Amino acid sequence: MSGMRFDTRLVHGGRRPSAGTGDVVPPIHVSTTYERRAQPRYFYGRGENPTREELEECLAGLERAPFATVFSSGQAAAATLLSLVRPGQCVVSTDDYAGTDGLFDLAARQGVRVRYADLTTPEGIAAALAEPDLALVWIETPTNPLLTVVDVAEVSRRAHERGARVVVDNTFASPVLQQPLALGADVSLYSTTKSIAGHADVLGGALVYRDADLHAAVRAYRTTAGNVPGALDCFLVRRGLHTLSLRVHRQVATARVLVERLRASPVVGAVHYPGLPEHPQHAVVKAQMSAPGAIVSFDYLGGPAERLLDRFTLFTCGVSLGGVHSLVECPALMTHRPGIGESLIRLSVGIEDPQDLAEDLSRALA
Amino acid sequence: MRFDTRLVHGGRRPSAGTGDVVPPIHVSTTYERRAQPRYFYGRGENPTREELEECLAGLERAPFATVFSSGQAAAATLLSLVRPGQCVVSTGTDGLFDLAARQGVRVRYADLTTPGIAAALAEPDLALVWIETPTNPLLTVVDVAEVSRRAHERGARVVVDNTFASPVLQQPLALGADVSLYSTTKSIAGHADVLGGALVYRDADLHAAVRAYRTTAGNVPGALDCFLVRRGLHTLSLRVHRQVATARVLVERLRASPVVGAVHYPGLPEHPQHAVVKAQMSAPGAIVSFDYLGGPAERLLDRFTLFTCGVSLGGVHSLVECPALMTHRPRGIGESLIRLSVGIEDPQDLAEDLSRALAG
Amino acid sequence: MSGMRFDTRLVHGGRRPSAGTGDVVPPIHVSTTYERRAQPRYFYGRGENPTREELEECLAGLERAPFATVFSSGQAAAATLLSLVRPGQCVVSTVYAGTDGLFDLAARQGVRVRYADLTTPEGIAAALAEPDLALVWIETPTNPLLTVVDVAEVSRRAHERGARVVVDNTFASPVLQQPLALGADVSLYSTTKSIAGHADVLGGALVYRDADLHAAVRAYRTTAGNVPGALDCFLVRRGLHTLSLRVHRQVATARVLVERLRASPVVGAVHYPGLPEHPQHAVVKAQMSAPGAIVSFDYLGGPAERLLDRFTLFTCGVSLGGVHSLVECPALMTHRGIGESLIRLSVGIEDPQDLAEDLSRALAG
Amino acid sequence: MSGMRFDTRLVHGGRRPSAGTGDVVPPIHVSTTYERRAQDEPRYFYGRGENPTREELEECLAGLERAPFATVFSSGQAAAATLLSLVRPGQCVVSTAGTDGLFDLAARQGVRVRYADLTTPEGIAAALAEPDLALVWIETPTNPLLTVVDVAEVSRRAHERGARVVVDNTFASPVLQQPLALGADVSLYSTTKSIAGHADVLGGALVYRDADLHAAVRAYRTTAGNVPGALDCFLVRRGLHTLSLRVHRQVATARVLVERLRASPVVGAVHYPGLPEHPQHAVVKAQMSAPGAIVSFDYLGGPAERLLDRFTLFTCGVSLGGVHSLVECPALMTGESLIRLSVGIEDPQDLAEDLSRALAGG
């Protein structure tokens, strides 16, 4: 895919020729096992599968990286990365997803030290990375659900001085808007369940990275732990991936419209969105994101959140994000129910007509 | 419902409104909260997955089952529940054992064919006894009822890897074990076209732990995969009984061949644990191994025209491998030990292929 | 598949392991179009598809035939064969309401459809005396009364008159009946039923030997576009692996249910090819290896709609041949000598004692 | 779908709530048969007739044209065959291809097929003067020269004579052209192309308003059995979500490529509805919201087969409308030197460079 620009790589990355038949869309490789005498690279599906490899090739290509590994889910991608951290070693994470905290709790019970910190300030960064035995700095940016953003290039340099690996959970931004490896991180982490697959009909995760020893370690764990995705699942993720830039560009454009509606509403308090000049880290946003994304959160002042949630007729009240269907949730009641107020609302903008979405939001806020 | 009926109707939840006989495939990752309140997100809840789990649980008359992205993932989940400083006694899974050991789990290997058992369970802080029966690839058998009684005296949990036998032939929970472990990739799905794993068990606290781990570690299967595993499961008893019948035919063929030595099969009268086999297996299974005396295993392997030379087992296509060259390439496993996984092809065609390969 | 017996062909027919990767199970070819420069046999999905072709090779192998063609449904397979009959020509048939829908369509385009009794020599002689006879259309056993037609004899007589003979072999499946070996020119299938066997995909098939027929059939399929999807072909092929296991089980259980029906005081006539008193039992012994998994009977115990309501294991619904046992009342359902109280059973692979108990509870004799 | 604008209907058209579980994406109904006793209202009997997944796709498609009815098929050809089955012996079809494959069949069934030039008032009048005229069959823009037919005018005139009008709208898609709003009776699609859009499923569709037509269409589909599978319907529906995003992108890139073509010394005529000099430019502006994603041109540089071999990004193969850009030479595949491009959603600069490199050689 050398010489292919990003949108071209979405369509043709890993689109391996079919010998003999010439299929434009690669056939779906469902076989669990392989005839050894007919080859010698493919032995067993948990280890090797052409449809999976094609998706991995595409994902790697999207960040100009040599390696990628896909998993049964975003959590599995994250768990795989955490397994490489030894008991006694330390993980530093942003203080601002409940999923990753569940994993962090699991890692803690295995003896991993988890430290939460403010990575938006030089003071907070300095203190965090002063942690002894620092092995991994875990950056989510923009964060969920307050959408604070962390200077990946800066934190990476500081972390690399201390010998630590840096991972960026790039799920919110997607590789259309943010390129962590180019920013200096060692790993990009994805829940491909969200915008990468984009149609809310398949679970998946991915890690994208450049280090060969990390690669060997990652594949070893995936093989032994068996958190591999199915071939049909990889097919759906890969198919959704074609339209990723078209979809993200639309969602961002609509998000901007919705933000203006929110800021003009007498019943909305704080509005959290990376594209706002008043965003506490806007300069960083301009430095590392090509566009401010499709996720918005805000404080609803009009009463109980459930009343707001009940009034939407187009937004779906449900969890997850990044898909073609617009979604709304209340973190306190839903994802973060186990600075997040009881009335914080999070929007994931889909690809519906922006005026329909704007009118629905406006009716809801009433 | 009897067993064969549960294969078809287990977890077959009627569709409201439309009345689908085959339940529709639930691919959605998320759910509308206002339209229900049990389903929140696909990694935690999915109707297609739940229907499969209900079926599997029903096959062992158990209250619980949980499916996974693979057999390895089911095993990893079970192993995650063992705490550092605690001990696992056992008869890949060894790859998983290396992982567990490096995190502070004590793994002890023992001979569980002898009353080895007493010595094994004398281990302090014994938390889990991990049994495969019949074993791979020598098809030795472990008395599950006996080991479970002794292990429960010591406060330990017992798991049986029941992949080789399947619930058609062996019922570990009924024998006294706490957990049945499966690679559903093998005979349960049966068509070599989907990966999966399962745990079947009865303890409610275990259920909570297993699901909590699965949701957090995210080693869940996709809905389309669950559909394929469930679809294959309909014919599990038909397939297994055919495979057993043919295996018996192949065993007679092997016993008559001059280039065959030891033959390993739970169904042989001379089998060292035959009494245990008759006691806990309703039939002796579709896996056969034997020592090839004609030379290097590749000389034999290259001559098959119907058996496929490849790993895995239990599916409709007959498979042959040499553990020393293949699965066990990284215990009584000779360089020329051959393992057969019998499929549902015509038994005369398979017998003829085996004989031709052996003769040259 | 030379040297492969029937059960082996079910598993390995049309299964050529993948070059390079060596997949045991062939990958699913979903692509609609093909790069011309990378090959030159594959141009467009409506015409060519490797997954579909593998299924066709398998079906063909089951009857030792050179050709097979699969379709979007059994109806489409039937429609295709009927398309080859010209206005003014005649079709003689024994039949399925579907096939009657199609026969009505063909008639409105000028095809002459003559229905006959093909179980007696006079009826056979009378039918085949039709001028411009192009096609003799045999369903055996028939739906839902399960009468049977001597395929060999009718084929002999029809070929004397220069006509093509097709046998709808859906009820029997190639496990139990081989129309081409009996002398017919075409086997017609709704693969939706026992061939796919799991009630989760629609499909049709034609199996035959004439190369000119092959050309005409494929030309129509491409032009009419009644082709199945690749994923559907995958599900049919996957189901086909267990066809003989499934059919043998369904047949064994059907025999048990037939005995239960014969013992019931609220059952009158029982229709089953396996019964000694069956009007064509001798033909049955001659052309079917076992009498099949379909049974019909006259219920004497009260309203049919109530009988249907009392089943708790059998599903009340149309279609047949799948792993799930099905029950219907033709007068109320598919056909809405067929009495108002005729019941049809399609036996699945559930435990025979469970099915027998469900039937007895429903009959409430 | 009342109150939903077009792009919203793409996502939410036919997205039927799942009772109990609340699935956002409806589950895939693969079952061929249904328990009759499990239904409050008996609507589902057998898959060849009824299927919820198929119906959801139909509801969506119908919604995209604000039409009461839609019916989907195993392929575009099956959709066409179905419509042609409704033309009775002695009646006449007037038409502007596989459709010509179908027309031959109709001829052998006693249908009179007349071809006419529908771009002129003289040509239209002559065409519509046919006795027993039952059906006017319009493709616009046409394949492969992209000429355009005035749907409103032909429909007005054809309805004067009591005939039905169908427009094959596959090239334009409902994003760009709305035949029913223009006065036609039926919109015909190969959903295989841009509607599904990912070149991985076959399908056809008819969209229309007349209830008697609906009954006849469904009757034929059930009897002929040219129904699509539920999994295929799922893939078509899934592709449909991004239809407007894809088409708008393809059109933008098509415009860029037309400029590259107009600048090439080895290109003659360039055929594209968007060109000011286009012989039917007034009609294009009147009935298409954008000029589409198909371009054809006369290649002057040598044998076409050599040119086809030089593409490294465009795929040489038939079909169109998908995310992958395609190129073919009609004379060789589907003047001797005419090339047809189907523009996908790759980066426009990558596509322009590939085209320029191919045209240039070396």
JSON list of C-alpha atoms in Angstrom, two decimals, chain B residues 203-291:
[
{"chain": "B", "resi": 203, "resn": "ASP", "atom": "CA", "xyz": [-22.13, -23.30, 41.48]},
{"chain": "B", "resi": 204, "resn": "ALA", "atom": "CA", "xyz": [-23.73, -19.85, 41.61]},
{"chain": "B", "resi": 205, "resn": "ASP", "atom": "CA", "xyz": [-20.68, -18.08, 43.07]},
{"chain": "B", "resi": 206, "resn": "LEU", "atom": "CA", "xyz": [-18.56, -19.59, 40.32]},
{"chain": "B", "resi": 207, "resn": "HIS", "atom": "CA", "xyz": [-21.10, -18.32, 37.81]},
{"chain": "B", "resi": 208, "resn": "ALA", "atom": "CA", "xyz": [-20.69, -14.78, 39.10]},
{"chain": "B", "resi": 209, "resn": "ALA", "atom": "CA", "xyz": [-16.89, -14.98, 38.92]},
{"chain": "B", "resi": 210, "resn": "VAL", "atom": "CA", "xyz": [-16.81, -16.54, 35.46]},
{"chain": "B", "resi": 211, "resn": "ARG", "atom": "CA", "xyz": [-19.15, -13.97, 33.97]},
{"chain": "B", "resi": 212, "resn": "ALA", "atom": "CA", "xyz": [-17.38, -11.11, 35.71]},
{"chain": "B", "resi": 213, "resn": "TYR", "atom": "CA", "xyz": [-14.08, -12.26, 34.22]},
{"chain": "B", "resi": 214, "resn": "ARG", "atom": "CA", "xyz": [-15.53, -12.80, 30.75]},
{"chain": "B", "resi": 215, "resn": "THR", "atom": "CA", "xyz": [-17.13, -9.36, 30.66]},
{"chain": "B", "resi": 216, "resn": "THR", "atom": "CA", "xyz": [-13.96, -7.65, 31.91]},
{"chain": "B", "resi": 217, "resn": "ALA", "atom": "CA", "xyz": [-11.41, -9.69, 29.86]},
{"chain": "B", "resi": 218, "resn": "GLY", "atom": "CA", "xyz": [-13.73, -9.53, 26.84]},
{"chain": "B", "resi": 219, "resn": "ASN", "atom": "CA", "xyz": [-13.09, -13.08, 25.62]},
{"chain": "B", "resi": 220, "resn": "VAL", "atom": "CA", "xyz": [-16.63, -13.38, 24.29]},
{"chain": "B", "resi": 221, "resn": "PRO", "atom": "CA", "xyz": [-17.61, -15.09, 21.03]},
{"chain": "B", "resi": 222, "resn": "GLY", "atom": "CA", "xyz": [-19.45, -13.24, 18.28]},
{"chain": "B", "resi": 223, "resn": "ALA", "atom": "CA", "xyz": [-23.15, -13.87, 17.68]},
{"chain": "B", "resi": 224, "resn": "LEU", "atom": "CA", "xyz": [-22.57, -15.34, 14.23]},
{"chain": "B", "resi": 225, "resn": "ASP", "atom": "CA", "xyz": [-20.05, -17.78, 15.76]},
{"chain": "B", "resi": 226, "resn": "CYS", "atom": "CA", "xyz": [-22.57, -18.76, 18.43]},
{"chain": "B", "resi": 227, "resn": "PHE", "atom": "CA", "xyz": [-25.08, -19.32, 15.63]},
{"chain": "B", "resi": 228, "resn": "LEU", "atom": "CA", "xyz": [-22.71, -21.73, 13.88]},
{"chain": "B", "resi": 229, "resn": "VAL", "atom": "CA", "xyz": [-21.86, -23.58, 17.09]},
{"chain": "B", "resi": 230, "resn": "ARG", "atom": "CA", "xyz": [-25.59, -23.88, 17.90]},
{"chain": "B", "resi": 231, "resn": "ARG", "atom": "CA", "xyz": [-26.39, -25.03, 14.39]},
{"chain": "B", "resi": 232, "resn": "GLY", "atom": "CA", "xyz": [-23.76, -27.77, 14.54]},
{"chain": "B", "resi": 233, "resn": "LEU", "atom": "CA", "xyz": [-24.95, -28.84, 17.96]},
{"chain": "B", "resi": 234, "resn": "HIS", "atom": "CA", "xyz": [-28.27, -30.16, 16.48]},
{"chain": "B", "resi": 235, "resn": "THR", "atom": "CA", "xyz": [-26.48, -33.17, 14.97]},
{"chain": "B", "resi": 236, "resn": "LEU", "atom": "CA", "xyz": [-23.99, -33.80, 17.81]},
{"chain": "B", "resi": 237, "resn": "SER", "atom": "CA", "xyz": [-25.41, -37.19, 18.87]},
{"chain": "B", "resi": 238, "resn": "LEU", "atom": "CA", "xyz": [-25.90, -38.36, 15.26]},
{"chain": "B", "resi": 239, "resn": "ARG", "atom": "CA", "xyz": [-22.28, -37.46, 14.43]},
{"chain": "B", "resi": 240, "resn": "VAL", "atom": "CA", "xyz": [-20.70, -38.81, 17.54]},
{"chain": "B", "resi": 241, "resn": "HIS", "atom": "CA", "xyz": [-22.41, -42.18, 17.33]},
{"chain": "B", "resi": 242, "resn": "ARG", "atom": "CA", "xyz": [-21.33, -42.48, 13.68]},
{"chain": "B", "resi": 243, "resn": "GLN", "atom": "CA", "xyz": [-17.78, -41.51, 14.56]},
{"chain": "B", "resi": 244, "resn": "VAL", "atom": "CA", "xyz": [-17.62, -44.07, 17.37]},
{"chain": "B", "resi": 245, "resn": "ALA", "atom": "CA", "xyz": [-18.98, -46.83, 15.11]},
{"chain": "B", "resi": 246, "resn": "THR", "atom": "CA", "xyz": [-16.34, -46.11, 12.48]},
{"chain": "B", "resi": 247, "resn": "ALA", "atom": "CA", "xyz": [-13.53, -45.78, 15.02]},
{"chain": "B", "resi": 248, "resn": "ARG", "atom": "CA", "xyz": [-14.31, -49.31, 16.11]},
{"chain": "B", "resi": 249, "resn": "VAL", "atom": "CA", "xyz": [-13.96, -50.49, 12.53]},
{"chain": "B", "resi": 250, "resn": "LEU", "atom": "CA", "xyz": [-10.64, -48.66, 12.16]},
{"chain": "B", "resi": 251, "resn": "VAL", "atom": "CA", "xyz": [-9.34, -50.17, 15.41]},
{"chain": "B", "resi": 252, "resn": "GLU", "atom": "CA", "xyz": [-9.90, -53.71, 14.03]},
{"chain": "B", "resi": 253, "resn": "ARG", "atom": "CA", "xyz": [-8.06, -52.65, 10.87]},
{"chain": "B", "resi": 254, "resn": "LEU", "atom": "CA", "xyz": [-5.11, -51.30, 12.87]},
{"chain": "B", "resi": 255, "resn": "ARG", "atom": "CA", "xyz": [-4.89, -54.40, 15.06]},
{"chain": "B", "resi": 256, "resn": "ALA", "atom": "CA", "xyz": [-4.49, -56.54, 11.94]},
{"chain": "B", "resi": 257, "resn": "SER", "atom": "CA", "xyz": [-1.75, -54.46, 10.29]},
{"chain": "B", "resi": 258, "resn": "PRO", "atom": "CA", "xyz": [1.87, -55.70, 10.57]},
{"chain": "B", "resi": 259, "resn": "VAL", "atom": "CA", "xyz": [3.25, -52.14, 10.65]},
{"chain": "B", "resi": 260, "resn": "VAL", "atom": "CA", "xyz": [1.18, -51.24, 13.68]},
{"chain": "B", "resi": 261, "resn": "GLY", "atom": "CA", "xyz": [2.38, -51.68, 17.26]},
{"chain": "B", "resi": 262, "resn": "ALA", "atom": "CA", "xyz": [0.51, -50.51, 20.34]},
{"chain": "B", "resi": 263, "resn": "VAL", "atom": "CA", "xyz": [-3.03, -49.38, 19.70]},
{"chain": "B", "resi": 264, "resn": "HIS", "atom": "CA", "xyz": [-4.52, -46.84, 22.12]},
{"chain": "B", "resi": 265, "resn": "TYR", "atom": "CA", "xyz": [-8.29, -46.80, 22.40]},
{"chain": "B", "resi": 266, "resn": "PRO", "atom": "CA", "xyz": [-10.60, -46.63, 25.41]},
{"chain": "B", "resi": 267, "resn": "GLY", "atom": "CA", "xyz": [-12.74, -49.38, 23.84]},
{"chain": "B", "resi": 268, "resn": "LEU", "atom": "CA", "xyz": [-10.09, -52.12, 23.82]},
{"chain": "B", "resi": 269, "resn": "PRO", "atom": "CA", "xyz": [-10.67, -54.97, 26.34]},
{"chain": "B", "resi": 270, "resn": "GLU", "atom": "CA", "xyz": [-6.99, -54.93, 27.22]},
{"chain": "B", "resi": 271, "resn": "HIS", "atom": "CA", "xyz": [-7.07, -51.18, 28.01]},
{"chain": "B", "resi": 272, "resn": "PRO", "atom": "CA", "xyz": [-5.32, -50.56, 31.38]},
{"chain": "B", "resi": 273, "resn": "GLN", "atom": "CA", "xyz": [-8.30, -48.64, 32.80]},
{"chain": "B", "resi": 274, "resn": "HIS", "atom": "CA", "xyz": [-11.07, -50.43, 30.91]},
{"chain": "B", "resi": 275, "resn": "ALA", "atom": "CA", "xyz": [-13.18, -50.83, 34.06]},
{"chain": "B", "resi": 276, "resn": "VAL", "atom": "CA", "xyz": [-13.12, -47.04, 34.52]},
{"chain": "B", "resi": 277, "resn": "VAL", "atom": "CA", "xyz": [-13.97, -46.57, 30.84]},
{"chain": "B", "resi": 278, "resn": "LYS", "atom": "CA", "xyz": [-17.07, -48.82, 31.13]},
{"chain": "B", "resi": 279, "resn": "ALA", "atom": "CA", "xyz": [-18.07, -46.96, 34.28]},
{"chain": "B", "resi": 280, "resn": "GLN", "atom": "CA", "xyz": [-17.92, -43.39, 33.03]},
{"chain": "B", "resi": 281, "resn": "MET", "atom": "CA", "xyz": [-18.14, -43.46, 29.23]},
{"chain": "B", "resi": 282, "resn": "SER", "atom": "CA", "xyz": [-21.29, -44.64, 27.44]},
{"chain": "B", "resi": 283, "resn": "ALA", "atom": "CA", "xyz": [-19.14, -45.39, 24.37]},
{"chain": "B", "resi": 284, "resn": "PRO", "atom": "CA", "xyz": [-15.36, -45.24, 23.84]},
{"chain": "B", "resi": 285, "resn": "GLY", "atom": "CA", "xyz": [-15.10, -42.18, 21.54]},
{"chain": "B", "resi": 286, "resn": "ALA", "atom": "CA", "xyz": [-13.81, -41.33, 18.08]},
{"chain": "B", "resi": 287, "resn": "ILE", "atom": "CA", "xyz": [-10.16, -40.67, 18.81]},
{"chain": "B", "resi": 288, "resn": "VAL", "atom": "CA", "xyz": [-7.62, -43.44, 18.15]},
{"chain": "B", "resi": 289, "resn": "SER", "atom": "CA", "xyz": [-3.87, -43.47, 18.42]},
{"chain": "B", "resi": 290, "resn": "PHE", "atom": "CA", "xyz": [-1.27, -46.03, 17.47]},
{"chain": "B", "resi": 291, "resn": "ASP", "atom": "CA", "xyz": [2.43, -46.67, 17.03]}
]
